[PDB]
Write a protein that binds this ligand. Structure first.
Ligand SMILES: CS(=O)(=O)Nc1ccc(Nc2ncc3cnn(C4CCCCCC4)c3n2)cn1
Length: 255
């Protein structure tokens, strides 16, 4: 591996905002298709995220579930780092949700199932993702769910997906990704996150006071799982397989 830019032709833009952009792109000589994140070194340490990115490449690259987006290599030049990324043909989950505004229960449970395994794997290797936002949940071609982003940690922007203990600031562990699974689960069937407000200030309270309600079209099966995960006291939360085990899941997923 010694990649310099001229080893690629760049396709259409893929997004995003925060750090620069992510591009469709193609390895000139094997004709390989990939996402090529381009991040200006300019706005990197000019923001202090740099060292908290190295040990997120670290984290990204030696990992390997099929339900986790893979990082191939990297490089840079004058400005900008370049992340050479697996490509997720069917786009993000954020956009599938806007498109269909809600998910059926067969589809949700599958997405949750896939998320557990990828998290359950992440948690054997003791790794904790922090933001499991739908912006970070891409889709493979078989429509497999693939986790993606960059705020991971050791053991032990919107708060919509964070749990109480974080937002205020306490000794946290892998019990965060399980609250995020709850927040997600809800968002999928309802289409909006259970703590949404129009301000960061409401949302903090809605989270602090665990303040959500279910629209009628939501089944006491799912109420039970989401109720269970989104408890305040971290130790209250199912462990990852007690989740997969959940009656409501199993009745509704792939395998
Ligand atoms: C616009 S869309 O409706 O969402 N279609 C779409 C979305 C994603 C992809 N593929 C893809 N593969 C790997 C990665 C790694 N990071 N990204 C980020 C791209 C920057 C925008 C934010 C999303 C994630 C990736 N995107 C293809 N098509």
């Amino acid at each position: 591996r010694q990649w310099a830019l001229e080893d690629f032709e760049i396709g259409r833009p893929l997004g995003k905002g925060k750090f620069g952009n992510v591009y469709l792109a193609r390895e000139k000589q094997s004709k390989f298709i990939l996402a090529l994140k381009v991040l200006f070194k300019a706005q990197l340490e000019k923001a202090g995220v740099e060292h908290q990115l190295r040990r997120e490449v670290e984290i990204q690259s030696h990992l390997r579930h099929p339900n986790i987006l893979r990082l191939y290599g990297y490089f840079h030049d004058a400005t900008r780092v370049y992340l050479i990324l697996e490509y997720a043909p069917l786009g993000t989950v954020y956009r599938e949700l806007q498109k269909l505004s809600k998910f059926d229960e067969q589809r949700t449970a599958t997405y949750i199932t896939e998320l557990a395994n990828a998290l359950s794997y992440c948690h054997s290797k003791r790794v904790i993702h922090r933001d499991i936002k739908p912006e970070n949940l891409l889709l493979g071609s078989a429509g497999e769910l693939k986790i993606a982003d960059f705020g991971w940690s050791v053991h032990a922007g919107t708060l919509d997906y964070l749990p109480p203990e974080m937002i205020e600031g306490r000794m946290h562990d892998e019990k965060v990704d399980l609250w995020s699974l709850g927040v997600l689960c809800y968002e999928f069937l309802v289409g909006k996150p259970p703590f949404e407000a129009n301000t960061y200030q409401e949302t903090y309270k809605r989270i602090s006071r665990v303040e959500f309600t279910f629209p009628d079209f939501v089944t006491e099966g799912a109420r039970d799982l989401i109720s269970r995960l989104l408890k305040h006291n971290p130790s209250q939360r199912p462990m990852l397989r007690e989740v997969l085990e959940h009656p409501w899941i199993t009745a509704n997923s792939s395998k």
